[PDB]
Structures are given as structure tokens and as C-alpha cells.
Amino acid sequence: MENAHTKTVEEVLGHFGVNESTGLSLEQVKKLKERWGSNELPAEEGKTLLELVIEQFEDLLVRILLLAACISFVLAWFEEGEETITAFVEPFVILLILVANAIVGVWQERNAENAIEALKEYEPEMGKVYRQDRKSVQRIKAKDIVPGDIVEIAVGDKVPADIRLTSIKSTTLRVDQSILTGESVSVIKHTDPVPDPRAVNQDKKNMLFSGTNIAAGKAMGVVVATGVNTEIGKIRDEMVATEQERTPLQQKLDEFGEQLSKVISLICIAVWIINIGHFNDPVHGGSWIRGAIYYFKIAVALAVAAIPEGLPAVITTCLALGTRRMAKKNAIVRSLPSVETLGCTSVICSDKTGTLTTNQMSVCRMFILDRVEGDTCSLNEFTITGSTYAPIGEVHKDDKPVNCHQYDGLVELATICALCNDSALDYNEAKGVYEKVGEATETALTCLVEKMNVFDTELKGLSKIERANACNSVIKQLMKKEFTLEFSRDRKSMSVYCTPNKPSMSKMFVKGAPEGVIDRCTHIRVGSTKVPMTSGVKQKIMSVIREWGSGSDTLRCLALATHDNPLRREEMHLEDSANFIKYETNLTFVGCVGMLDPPRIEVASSVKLCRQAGIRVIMITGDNKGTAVAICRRIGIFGQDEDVTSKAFTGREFDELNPSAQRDACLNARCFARVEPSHKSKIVEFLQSFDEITAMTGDGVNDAPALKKAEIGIAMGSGTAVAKTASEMVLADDNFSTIVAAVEEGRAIYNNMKQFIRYLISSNVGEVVCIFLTAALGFPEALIPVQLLWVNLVTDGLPATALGFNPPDLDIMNKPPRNPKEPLISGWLFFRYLAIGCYVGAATVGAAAWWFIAADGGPRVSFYQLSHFLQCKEDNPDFEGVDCAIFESPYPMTMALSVLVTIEMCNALNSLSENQSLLRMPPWENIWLVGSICLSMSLHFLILYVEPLPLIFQITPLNVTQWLMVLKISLPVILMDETLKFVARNYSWPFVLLIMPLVIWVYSTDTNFSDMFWS
Ligand code: BEF
Ligand SMILES: [Mg+2]
């Protein structure tokens, strides 16, 4: 069944072979089940643990670590030695770091799916259908309905399938379609066919779309589409068809991994090339192959040691900590890399109905009269602060609290509001929020009546379930509602006949569009006085009503009047519309109210903060252009008097725009209205075409393709499930300020990530340069792989985690988002961490050599003997026996390890700021860094001072003067990093007064290095 809206009821009924009054026979029911399936949206759960692990191993950094681990393992398998116990420790541990990380990430996934599923609406999805088995209404499951069923719908029901209207039994049919079409107000439905076959769902007035509630009335329809063929099903299919791309953080990490791999390959090739002439050495066997592969093995072993083993682990730790911080403020983030996406976001595409607004219409203004002199009147105007359906707001006149007993016109207005509606407000114990029963506007009037206690009834001890209807209950107990005059299309008003319950009358209460009520009223209720109507007062009322319904505060105005002396029920006949016209005569104007779909109270501040942070907010909605522009003006996207002739567009207007005009609109326009979900995705894609990180926010089904297409999609906690499944983050508490909070968190996370990435890379390149320098000169080895493993996982691991807690920059929220094209590590950074790395290598080699040359108490071995480590024989030494037993002493190794650790701690203290000096920013603020440094020193001393560990790591306790020399070697890294940082910047006192005694203490003495030869 295609374009059913274009066909009449007879055509669709003949096509389905179903009678209007009988329904479908049980045979046709199963015949349609076998063909069309069943009415369920498919729910696929293919994210098994194996799938999650394999997709989380997609990261290029993790792949590089895996390659390094496997190469190290195959190198350790062909080492022809008996030290396989330790030689295999280095790769294996990496695998643990690679696997444990995975669970962490996987855990986060499950945790998100455990939280997002918690905040899902759960109810039995039922449906009232007619079938030939029994004549009465049959309440069956919605999944057991088929295309062709005759469905009966009533007020406060959710339609279960795409339905073409057949007959309306309540003379009207109001449907709330904000879920699908994004319309803030309920739409009127009819039975007449829609001739347009390409018509959008907003103007399919004869159609009912699954997932949309019925605001008021009863109706009878026939199912034409079911399951995935419904509009929501088509949108879900489009959402699935949309491709998902990697987050910008993942792209930056992959680029950094490519740069790191290029550096590793260059280092390996260079080390191989430097030893071309040694290939044919007789030591290998005098062959061009064995020596070449031996030196290739050495070069690859050196290259593998330049990859930080713990870098992905600390990156994941920082991401998980940020995710936990966001979860603490009611923000569920699915993937760990997505926590950073909002930091680099440049454009925030949003949704008006249900996302930028509460979707709960509430009365925000009202007025009555106070006094009349002549050709004019004094007008009492009141403002109501409530925005949701909760009856907790207050009525303010001239921005001060006001009571309601003093204003008799106000109690009369409250009576008219509560008695001239048939909807209600009710509280869900499970959901925990008040909601409407029937029409949204009538619920707004009910909540207004609850807000202003016109009879000052006691409400302190009242429970929340009975808080919903207390004042309305009181003033409906006072007045008995006899009968209701139904609202008409030819007369935009509705009336209620009420009689005073107390004996010793029978007033009429009329509401509706202001024009009709004003032209049909000949009197004015001023306080308790019925004064004759005057042209001046009517003009004064028209002025305020138009300026209420025409400015940036565009409102839906309802005029409330009363008929004091109506004809008694015998005269009036409730049969014809013209009778209803003639019954409403000589009315008395009482007041007027003005309501809207109000934006959430944290929206204007959030958008101005986003604009301050360099992010522009563009509203994309399916509602009309007028309401969208009004909400943009109200929340601060547009000014009150700003011209929007080129900044607000409709889908039809955007359809035939020039490509240059489309580019200019995407660059400049800030409001899109009357756009289909495909149009929303097209807008998001056009914005992404300009290399802009786009964050889409929405709640409804129409936002799902746009939420999926954006780099990060944010779904409201009250939104639909399909919108939540397409979004990377969910706001559980529906707080829009969480967006700017997440932006700040992401920017801080990115800064800290850069800091500790630089720290780890510098440490590893320093160790590699140390090994290369040791090999080139010929000195005895100063470091061993197991020692480097410890100093890379603990001594470097703890400072990196602490650096993850770096204080945020002061000017973090006053800068534009970072350019996506810039690399994570720049060329200047590339130069700088090499400087610290080269200094670490040189300092560690020098510390190892100092104990063998100039240290007091150690052998004063010359450079020639020290360079010829392997030549410990009768080659004219001084202490030939002593030297052979001292070249393997643990003292130089301890010197090297201590110097490396101390320089790493100094570099960690230099990693508080990317370019801000340590003097101005002391370590005090990041107390986590100080605690981590102290803990690492404590455990290092424990390693140095226990029984087993000095055997496992060949290290021994040092002396006071030896520690002093270690500090002497380590400290200048502070000076060199400070001068590099100062150079970068150019182109407190307690910290100084504590560090000066330390500096003067350790530079009291100096030792000369007797070495003037190089290899
Ligand atoms: F709900 Be949005 F206005 F499409
Ligand atoms: Mg919405």
C-alpha cells in the first residue's frame, strides 16, 4: 500500500478487503501476518564481548603496541640463552596492558548500556482493534496488528501503526506529533484525501503515524503500514543506513600513531645503516647475511624500546576518569573517545521541540482589567515563572510576588480556566514527573490554576499525587458542570454551562481565540463590576493581544469571558453550529492568558556560554518558521530586533538554493524550520563538508539520522529510544548546561592528554638514546630491559596518571575550538621532547661513566679501559684482577637508574603546563602530582632496600654523596626545560624560597670529568 493518504476511504478499504464496521476475519489476520510480519521495530544486539574487543583493538596505537609485543616475543624466542624467564617478561606484560585496557573500555560500553536502558519508558504497548470474532472492542497487543485492521483511538492513547482515518466520532481529532514531525502544537486531523503524493508528514492530515499520542477526541482508522514500513520504521532504516565515522580524538591519535611509526622506522633504518661496514666482520662468521641479520635484530630491539608501553593505558584511564566525571552530573557517555568530542566541537545543531524547549506548554502571561475612565483602561498584567507541568511556579506582577484573593477578577479567571476544560494533570509515582492527561493547552490552564492559589487553601501537608488537582478540585466542587458547548471550526471558542452548587445563577464560561470572544462580548468585568463595553477599551485590549502574539515573545492567546444571564437549557438546542453562534451573545470579558512551549531555563545561559567559547548554535526543527524564530529570539540565538531575512530558512527555501547560496546559508544561517529528517542529515553533512565538528542534539525520532550523522549526538533523557540509540551521549536529567560542562571537560582532557603523551614519549626516547650512546662508545651497559619495564610502568605510569589531573587553563572557555587540521604533536614539540630525551640519555650514560672514572671510592678507570669493556685480559691494566670483577658492579647501574628516575620526576613536574613556567605555576595546585612523585620515591627506596628486589634488579643502596651527585646530574633538566618553555612562550615566592636552599645545598662541590676522547 503506497501513498494511502492520496486515496479515499473506499479505495483503501477495497484494497484491503475489510469492512468498516466488522473488521478483519481471523483467516485474513494470519494471512496478513505471514505476508507483512509483525508490528515490532527490530532490536539487534550484535555487540558481543568478542566483537567489542576486536573493534576496540582497531586503534592504531594498540596495533603498534601489539606489533612491538609480537616482535619482542619472536626476538626473545631466538636469543639462544638460558634467561628466558625474564627476556619474555617484557612482551607478555605489554599483552596484559593491551588486554586489560580492553575490558575497561568494554566495561564502559556495558555501563552506558546499563544506564541508558534504565531511563527507558516501559509500558505494555496495547491496541484497540475490531475483528469479526466478536463485535465489541478487542484490546490486543500492538505487535499482533496487521495492515488492514480497523483501529479505534481515544484520548490519551498511543497509536500503534500507520493508520488512514476512516471516521471521526468526536467531531474533532487532535494529535500530538512532536515525536515525529517536531510540531509543538497538536494538529487537527480530517478524513478528506490529500491530493499530493510527495506530501510531507506535517500536511498528511488524514494519516496517523505510530508513536504519536492522541491529544483529544476519538476516531476510527484502518492500518495501512506496519512494522518497519511505518514512518518511524523508515526513519530507523535511514538511521541504520547512515555511516558512522571515527571521533576526532581517535583521528588525532591515529595520526600520532602514524608519526610514531614513521619515527620508529627511521630510527631502525638509521641504526642499521650506521653499521653497514661491520656486516662482513669475522666475529659473525665472515658472511654478508648473518652479520646483517644480527645488526637488524639489534636495530629492531632498539626501535621496539622507543614505543611507550603504558601510553594507551594512561589514555584510557584519563578518558574513563572524564567519563565518570560526566556521569556524576547526569551525562551517560557510551564510548570513551567521545568524551573529548564536544571540546573540539565548532557547531552545535539543536532541536526546538522537546530539546531546546520543555515540550510542556505552560501559561506565561495573563491580564485583566483594574479601572476604566474613558476610551481607555488600566490593565493588570501578571507573569508566571513555571515552564514544566509541575504546579510549583508563582504569579508575579511588576516582578514582585502577588496574592490572588485581592484580585477578584483573578479568581474569576481561575474559575473560568479550571471549569472550561476537560483535561487534567496527573503525577506518575514511577516516572516522578507531572504530566498531562488530554490537551496540552488545557493542561497548561490547569497547572496555572494550581499555581495561583486563588482560594488560599492549605497545601503544605498535601502529597504530590494529590497536589496535581487541589485548587481545580475545590473550585469544581463549588460549581457543578451541567454541560459543555463543544468547540467549533467556524467559531474559535468553546463554552461550559455551570451552576452554583450552593442553593440561592447558572453562569456560562467561554474561552477561545481573542477576536471572536471580544466581538461577541458587550460587557467588561472590572473587579466585581459589569461595565458596558467601550471602543477604547476594546482597542487597548487588541493592542496588548497583538503585541503578545506578534513580538519575539510569540504566544498563543486565549480570551476568557463569562455570560452572566444565559438562556436556560430548554431554549438552547445542542444540535447545530449556528445555534452555538447565537447562544454566545452579550458576553462579559473577564481576562486573557498567553502560553507557549517554553525553553528550558538553562538554555539561554548555555547558548551564550557556547558563543563565548567559539561555538555557534544552529536550530534545526520540523516546526513552522514563526515559532522557531520566536524561540531563537527568546533563547538568544537571535536578537529581539535582529533581521533574519538571510539567517532563517525553511526546507523548501533551502531546496532550490544555489550551491554558493547553500554554502553561505550553512555558514551564516542559525535557524532551519520545516525540515524532514533527511533534510536535517543533509544540513549536518553540509556543515561537516566545511571541516567543522558538528554536535547534534535532539530527542525525537526525526533527529535520529542527524544524531547519527554528527560526530557526537546528544539525546535528551526524555527523548525516544531510537534517538538515544543514535546518540553517543544522553542527558539523564535533561540539563542543557551539561553541554558546556562536557565541552570544558573535553578541552581539559585534551590538554592533559597532550601533556602526558609528551612526557611518556620523551621518557622512552631518552631511554633509547641512552642505550644507543652506551652501544656506540662501548661502555658497559647501564640499563637492562627489566629495569626499563619497571621505570616505564610504575615510575612513568604514576606521574602520567597524576598529570591527567592537571588544573584547567584559566582562559579555557574564552578561546575558539582548536583547528581540526593541526596535529596532536607539532614540529616544535617534536624538537622539544627530543631535547629532554637526548639529555636523559647523555645524563644517564655520564652518570654510569662517572662511577668508573671520577667517583671517590670507586676505581679511577681511564676512558680507554672503560671503552674496552670486553677487553678485560692481560692487556696492560693496572688492577687487572680488580677491574674484571668491577666492570659488572651494580653501582653504575644504580647510578643510571636513579638518575633516570629523578630526571623523569623532574620532567613530570615540568609537565604541569604546556608553555607556562613552573615558577608561576607551582606543583602545589596539582597535589595529585606531588603525591604520585612521593609514592614513586617511596617505592623506589623500597626496591632499593628489601631482600629480593636488589637481586631481581641489579641495584644496591647508595651513599649521601652519591645521591648528591645524582641530584646534581638530574637538576639541570629543570633549567633546560624552563629555557625551552620560555623560548616557546616568547616566540610562587614560597616555591622559590623552598627551592633555593635545595639548589644551593646540592651544588656546594663539583667533580671534574677526566675524559677528552670520543669514538
Ligand atoms: F523536535 Be524538533 F523541533 F524536530
Ligand atoms: Mg524534538
SS3 content of the chain, % helix, strand, coil (to 5): 45, 15, 35
Residue whose C-alpha is closest to residue 841's, from 934, 929, 790, 779: 779
What grid cell was written down for 738? 551539561
Asked if 300 and 291 count as a contact pair (C-beta separation under 8 A), the reply is: no
Is the CB of 354 inside a 6 Å radius of any atom of ligand 1?
Answer: yes
At residue 591, what are phi and psi to the nearest 5 degrees? -175, -165
Residue whose C-alpha is closest to residue 468's, from 488, 495, 494, 450: 450
Asked if 200 and 182 count as a contact pair (C-beta separation under 8 A), the reply is: no
For cell 544522553, the residue is 730
CA distances from 808 to 47, 331, 344, 357, 750 (A): 36, 20, 16, 32, 10
Helix (H, G, I), strand (E, B) or coil at 210: coil
Distance CA 509, CA 587 (A): 9
Give the DSSP letter string of 245-281. ---HHHHHHHHHHHHHHHHHHHHHHHHHHHTSTTTT-
Distance 322 CA to ligand 2 centre (A): 28
Extended strands (E) in 465-520: 479-485, 493-500, 508-512
Ordered strands of the 712-716 beta sheet:
332-333, 729-731, 712-716, 694-698, 347-350, 616-620, 671-673, 648-650
Distance CA 973, CA 903 (A): 7
Q: Are strands 207-208 and 162-168 parallel, antiparallel or unpaired?
A: antiparallel
Ligand nearest to the CA of 715: 2
Q: Are strands 347-350 and 616-620 parallel, antiparallel or unpaired?
A: parallel
Please give the radius of gyration of the chain, using alpha carbons only, rounded to the nearest integer: 39
Is the CB of 184 inside a 6 Å radius of any atom of ligand 1?
Answer: no
DSSP letter (8 states) at residue 293: H
Q: Which CATH architecture has domain 362-596?
A: 3-Layer(aba) Sandwich (3.40)
User: At residue 362, what is the residue type?
Assistant: S
Which residues 6+ apart lie within 8 Å of 477 measured at CB? 501
Number of C-beta neighbours around residue 264 at 10 A: 21
Number of C-beta neighbours around residue 747 at 10 A: 22
Distance CA 486, CA 496 (A): 8
What grid cell was written down for 28? 485474513
Distance 698 CA to ligand 1 centre (A): 7
CA distances from 250 to 711, 759, 805 (A): 11, 20, 21
For cell 534504565, the residue is 118
Helix (H, G, I), strand (E, B) or coil at 500: strand
Q: Which helix (DSSP H) or strand (DSSP E) does residue 997 occupy?
A: helix 989-1002
Residues listed for the chain: 1015
Is the CB of 720 inside a 6 Å radius of any atom of ligand 1?
Answer: no
At residue 347, what are phi and psi to the nearest 5 degrees? -125, 135
Residue whose C-alpha is closest to residue 745's, from 336, 350, 314: 336
Asked if 192 and 7 count as a contact pair (C-beta separation under 8 A), the reply is: no
Residues in binding site for Ca(2+): 304-305, 307, 309, 764, 767, 792, 795-796, 904
Distance CA 383, CA 385 (A): 7
At residue 784, what are phi and psi to the nearest 5 degrees? -125, 155
Number of C-beta neighbours around residue 135 at 10 A: 11
Question: Structure solved using which method?
Answer: cryo-EM
Handedness of CA 699, 704, 705, 707 (dihedral sign): positive
Helix (H, G, I), strand (E, B) or coil at 799: helix
Extended strands (E) in 10-153: 126-131, 134-141, 150-153
Distance CA 904, CA 840 (A): 8
What grid cell was written down for 757? 603523551
Helix (H, G, I), strand (E, B) or coil at 326: helix
User: At residue 73, what is the residue type?
Assistant: F
Which residues pair with residue 613 across a beta bridge?
none
Choice from 179, 186, 355 to test ligand 1 binding pocket (greatest atom count within 8 A of CB): 355
Number of C-beta neighbours around residue 118 at 10 A: 9
Ligand nearest to the CA of 625: 1
Q: Is 341 exposed, middle or buried (0-12, 13-18, 19+ CB in 10 A)?
A: buried
At residue 510, what are phi and psi to the nearest 5 degrees? -120, 140
User: At residue 662, what is the residue type?
Assistant: Q
Torsion of the alpha carbons at 922, 925, 927 and 930, rounded to the nearest 10: -10
From the list 149, 176, 351, 703, the catalytic residue is 351
Distance 489 CA to ligand 2 centre (A): 28
What grid cell was written down for 627? 515559532
Residue whose C-alpha is closest to residue 340's, from 611, 51, 695, 708: 695
- Go through the chain and list every residue after which a break occurs, taking a C to next N gap over 2.5 angstroms, comma-separated: 504, 987
Which residues 6+ apart lie within 8 Å of 256 measured at CB? 61, 757, 823, 824, 825
Which ligand 1 atom sits nearest the alpha carbon of residue 359? 1
Handedness of CA 712, 716, 717, 721 (dihedral sign): negative
Distance CA 427, CA 95 (A): 54
Is the CB of 841 inside a 6 Å radius of any atom of ligand 1?
Answer: no
Give the DSSP letter string of 622-689. SS-HHHHHHHHHHHTSS-SS---TTTEEEHHHHHT--HHHHHHHHHH--EEES--HHHHHHHHHHHHH
Residue whose C-alpha is closest to residue 238's, from 703, 561, 598: 703
Residues in binding site: 304-305, 307, 309, 351, 353, 442, 489, 511, 556, 621-623, 674, 680, 699, 702, 764, 767, 792, 795-796, 904
Ordered strands of the 213-216 beta sheet:
187-188, 174-176, 213-216
Is the CB of 309 inside a 6 Å radius of any atom of ligand 1?
Answer: no
Q: Are strands 694-698 and 712-716 parallel, antiparallel or unpaired?
A: parallel
Give the DSSP letter string of 897-945. HHHHHHHHHHHHHTTS-SSS-TTTS-TTS-HHHHHHHHHHHHHHHHHHT
Asked if 358 and 600 count as a contact pair (C-beta separation under 8 A), the reply is: yes
Distance CA 170, CA 749 (A): 58
Cα angle at 208 between 205 and 214, to 5 degrees? 100
Residue 521: which region, alpha, beta or left (left: phi > 0; alpha: psi -120 to 50)?
A: beta
Which residues pair with residue 563 across a beta bridge?
508
Which ligand 1 atom sits nearest the alpha carbon of residue 675? 4
Distance 597 CA to ligand 1 centre (A): 12
Distance 183 CA to ligand 2 centre (A): 8
What grid cell was written down for 481? 458542570
Ligand nearest to the CA of 619: 1
Is the CB of 621 inside a 6 Å radius of any atom of ligand 1?
Answer: yes
Q: Are strands 671-673 and 648-650 parallel, antiparallel or unpaired?
A: parallel
Choice from 177, 178, 635, 722 to test ligand 1 binding pocket (greatest atom count within 8 A of CB): 178
DSSP letter (8 states) at residue 354: I
Q: Which helix (DSSP H) or strand (DSSP E) does residue 364 occupy?
A: strand 362-372
Which residues 6+ apart lie within 8 Å of 587 measured at CB? 510, 517, 520, 521, 522, 523, 561, 562, 563
Distance CA 939, CA 933 (A): 10
Handedness of CA 322, 324, 330, 336 (dihedral sign): positive
Which residues 6+ apart lie within 8 Å of 864 measured at CB? 1013
Which ligand 1 atom sits nearest the alpha carbon of residue 351? 2
Is the CB of 352 inside a 6 Å radius of any atom of ligand 1?
Answer: yes
Residue whose C-alpha is closest to residue 907's, from 751, 988, 796, 786: 796
Asked if 594 and 549 count as a contact pair (C-beta separation under 8 A), the reply is: yes
Torsion of the alpha carbons at 583, 585, 591 and 597, rounded to the nearest 10: 50
Distance 72 CA to ligand 1 centre (A): 56
At residue 810, what are phi and psi to the nearest 5 degrees? -65, -40
CA distances from 613 to 338, 345, 754, 915 (A): 19, 10, 20, 21
Q: Which helix (DSSP H) or strand (DSSP E) does residue 66 occupy?
A: helix 60-77
Helix (H, G, I), strand (E, B) or coil at 120: coil
Choice from 353, 619, 716, 720 to test ligand 1 binding pocket (greatest atom count within 8 A of CB): 353
Which residues pair with residue 984 across a beta bridge?
none
DSSP letter (8 states) at residue 818: P
Which ligand 1 atom sits nearest the alpha carbon of residue 355? 1
Extended strands (E) in 688-782: 694-698, 712-716, 729-731
What grid cell was written down for 184? 509543538
Residue whose C-alpha is closest to residue 452's, from 479, 412, 421: 412
Residue 351 annotated among the catalytic residues of the structure: yes
Asked if 498 and 485 count as a contact pair (C-beta separation under 8 A), the reply is: no
Is the CB of 351 inside a 6 Å radius of any atom of ligand 1?
Answer: yes
Which ligand 1 atom sits nearest the alpha carbon of residue 184? 3
Which residues pair with residue 207 across a beta bridge?
164
Distance CA 874, CA 876 (A): 6
Distance CA 796, CA 789 (A): 10
Is the CB of 182 inside a 6 Å radius of any atom of ligand 1?
Answer: yes
Helix (H, G, I), strand (E, B) or coil at 803: helix
Choice from 621, 627, 701, 714 to test ligand 1 binding pocket (greatest atom count within 8 A of CB): 621
Q: Are strands 521-526 and 219-225 parallel, antiparallel or unpaired?
A: unpaired
Distance 857 CA to ligand 1 centre (A): 81
At residue 172, what are phi and psi to the nearest 5 degrees? -160, 160
At residue 930, what are phi and psi to the nearest 5 degrees? -65, -45
Number of C-beta neighbours around residue 287 at 10 A: 13
Cα angle at 494 between 492 and 497, to 5 degrees? 155
Torsion of the alpha carbons at 651, 652, 653 and 657, rounded to the nearest 10: 100
Choice from 235, 351, 357, 635 to test ligand 1 binding pocket (greatest atom count within 8 A of CB): 351
Is the CB of 892 inside a 6 Å radius of any atom of ligand 1?
Answer: no
Distance 310 CA to ligand 2 centre (A): 43
Is the CB of 627 inside a 6 Å radius of any atom of ligand 1?
Answer: no
What grid cell was written down for 859? 676505581
One-letter-per-residue 3-state SS of 944-966:
HCCCCHHHHCCCCCCCHHHHHHH
For cell 551525562, the residue is 331
For cell 596532536, the residue is 824
Exposed e or buried b per residue across 200-215, where buried means at least 16 C-beta atoms within 10 angstroms of its C-beta: ebbebbbbbbbbbbbb
Is the CB of 622 inside a 6 Å radius of any atom of ligand 1?
Answer: yes
Q: Is 947 exposed, middle or buried (0-12, 13-18, 19+ CB in 10 A)?
A: exposed
User: At residue 535, what is the residue type?
Assistant: S
DSSP letter (8 states) at residue 158: B
Q: Is 4 exposed, middle or buried (0-12, 13-18, 19+ CB in 10 A)?
A: buried
Distance CA 437, CA 354 (A): 18
Which ligand 1 atom sits nearest the alpha carbon of residue 702? 4
Cα of first residue to Cα of last residue in the chain, in angstroms, is 87
For cell 531546546, the residue is 356
Distance 353 CA to ligand 2 centre (A): 4
Q: Kindly provide the resolution of this structure in angstroms, with one decimal.
A: 3.0
Residues in binding site for ATP: 353, 442, 489, 511, 556, 621-623, 674, 680, 702
CA distances from 101 to 98, 106, 156, 685 (A): 6, 9, 49, 33
Number of C-beta neighbours around residue 35 at 10 A: 9
Residue whose C-alpha is closest to residue 991's, from 897, 899, 919, 904: 919
Distance CA 410, CA 147 (A): 52
For cell 629555557, the residue is 979
Which residues, chain by chain, have CB under 5 Å from ion ligand 2?
Answer: 351, 353-354, 699-700
